[PDB]
Unconditional design. Structure first.
Lengths: 408, 408
């Protein structure tokens, strides 16, 4: 993640996560030994048990694997999502219009450069995009053009195998959308689960009893079922079939949307932790991936022309990223303001960036000095810590500059 | 309406609409005789049959009735909508806090000045509000405060008696809103019928067959009934009871929303006339009253805090006023552009007002000169007719001024 120099790098065991340590990770770990321009030498100690020792020596003497890219379809695969995405991007973008061009493109891949089957993989990917009509075939050979369902995947950056599920889910929402709360909007922008946390199903079912009626109404629409939650409480649930994989994913996705609903209502991370069991960094790493996904789904609906969906969803990318009520969404345009600092300026009465740009800097200082509880009390992710006087002056001047940029 | 002077005002019959002419109307008619500074005398001829001569004399010699206002509750009335609004509008505004103030306010009323029963009429209106939680009561006498439902009825200028149906309809929509098209929104912003036209029920039922499935899914939600339309086709239908009055109103309101949906999608008035039977001026007078009502429902939902409703509804006031697609809503900010002129500039490629301010005036001239089909070809409601060269120059300079005003 970050370059930190250290003199002594200790690795407590050659085994990580129940696996032997990856040589790439080990060389990244050990490569941080030695404080540049301060140490005479760097030191690393792999602490190793007598039973581990053969693995430990393998880490010291081993060297990185050659690169081999995902465009190789494995045994029993006729297509790969990276290749499908590749063929989509060139057809829908229009830079490869014909099968003669698609072979000419594929010869530029690192797969071709590594081989220097692929001519079959191209055709199999074309066939998948065609049968679902991400692309359409016209007679010249064949000339392939996108549909609206194709062009939307390229603009959204959504994976097209997921796009069939996203597309049908959004249509089924529009057939009957619960505007009564933001939970139905949230559910559609929740990511696929990807094990962002270990769900405590006995907590989740005991929340489901308390869950507001207008949120259980969403749950029945999206497909949650309280008998299956009780079956998760009763014991281990396993999915053998793609039907069962989809059935289970809905409940994990709904639990995620409840965490986000607390997150976009400024519920403190300590209270979310106590209520759902999540760690702070799990909630924040969920928050980033949901905010990214909320962007994709907006552009996807806009390209299709679901104008009433893009109105609702567009607010949520910013609103998820900071995790704020609807009113703070203006203030946060000042990058010095997080949800905490925006709420204290909003609480005082600086409801909008234009009013904040008018503000007397001494008043912003006194608001921050009082509301937050020298010594660089405030942290700004692009800076070292700031004093109240310095942060307030930079806030006002940044708000004015935003007006200057917005008017220009 | 607009003052037109004429030398002879001829009135073809003393009977209008099957009724004797109103003396206020007759004196408004005859008062237009005589072209100021041109005629020596004005003339009016009431043409009258031998059977009507007694009515003719009654109009000719009659004089206007004394004015008498609606705050007099009739026999069998506990309260009047005007008095309920009056008593609300002072309580929710805080200008009359207690019953001592409400009797003091009533003494300022033209009702009191005309009488110079009402002290009971105030209490009956207070009681109707209180029981519905438009307002709430506290121990001092009593001190009355508005609820959110009362403050919404004030701010939106809606009537209090209709608000209970608007409120419960909007709630029932939010329990399950069809975003699949703009019709479910249009059903909520369309006014009550008020005899804006006479429905051709055999025509309407033949449309109800063709009606798109996503527009019949709305219809089942709002409460339209395929059997009741057939019952209107079968023969005359009447309502003896309020439960029957609203049942008929739902179908009249749905028919109105279909006319608006065609208008909202720029279907020409001649094609709407052929399709629905409306006159041009019936659509345009519906259009203006639907654009007023769309504003009220936005403010009502905003005050209650139905933020997801106010997002959807707010666009429709401008769309209804002009009868435009979503993309023209920016261009239309130029008051010289109607839906027709906005469509020809949007077709040429001036999608947004900033590009219209950049446009070369000679290019806008050539676009108007070509796209519309000297002699003041173009009509501007605030002006006499304009030449292509003059209208185009005024459009570009108005677009620039709109930027100057928006930046300032």
């Amino acid at each position: 993640g970050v370059n930190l120099p250290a003199r002594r790098v200790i690795i407590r065991t050659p085994i990580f996560g129940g696996r032997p340590l990856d040589i790439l990770t080990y060389k990244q770990m050990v490569g941080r030994a030695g404080r540049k321009g301060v140490d005479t030498v760097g030191e690393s100690i792999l602490i190793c048990k007598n039973s581990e020792k053969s693995k430990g020596i393998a880490l010291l003497q081993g060297s990185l694997k050659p690169v081999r890219s995902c465009l190789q379809r494995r045994e029993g695969e006729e297509v790969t999502g990276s290749m499908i995405r590749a063929i989509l991007e060139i057809i829908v973008g229009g830079v490869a219009s014909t099968s003669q061009d698609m072979h000419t493109y594929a010869a530029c891949t690192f797969l071709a450069a590594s081989m220097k089957v692929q001519l079959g993989a191209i055709e199999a990917c074309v066939m998948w995009l065609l049968e679902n009509e991400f692309i359409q075939s016209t007679e010249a050979g064949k000339v392939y053009h996108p549909t609206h369902l194709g062009s939307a995947t390229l603009s959204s950056s959504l994976s097209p195998a997921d796009t069939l599920d996203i597309f049908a889910d959004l249509q089924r929402a529009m057939k009957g959308f619960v505007l009564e709360n933001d939970l139905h909007i949230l559910y559609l922008v929740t990511p696929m689960f990807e094990d962002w946390t270990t769900i405590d199903w006995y907590r989740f079912f005991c929340l489901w009893e308390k869950l507001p009626t207008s949120m259980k109404r969403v749950a029945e629409l999206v497909g949650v079922e309280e008998g299956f939650l009780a079956r998760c409480v009763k014991g281990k649930v396993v999915a053998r079939t793609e039907r069962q994989h989809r059935q289970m994913a809905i409940h994990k996705r709904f639990f995620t949307s409840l965490v986000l609903l607390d997150l976009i209502s400024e519920v403190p991370l300590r209270e979310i932790n106590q209520k759902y069991g999540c760690n702070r960094g799990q909630i924040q790493s969920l928050q980033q991936s949901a905010a990214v996904y909320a962007g994709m789904i907006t552009v996807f609906s806009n390209r299709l022309g679901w104008h009433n969906m893009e109105l609702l969803l567009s607010q949520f990318q910013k609103r998820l990223t900071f995790g704020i009520q609807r009113e703070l969404c203006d203030l946060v345009r000042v990058s010095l303001l997080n949800a905490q600092r925006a709420r204290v300026l909003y609480a005082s009465g600086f409801h909008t960036v234009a009013d904040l740009a008018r503000a007397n800097i001494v008043e912003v200082e006194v608001i921050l000095k009082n509301a937050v509880p020298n010594m660089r009390t405030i942290w700004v992710t692009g800076r070292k810590g700031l004093t109240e006087r310095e942060a307030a002056a930079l806030i006002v001047e940044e708000a004015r500059m935003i007006l200057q940029q917005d008017l220009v």
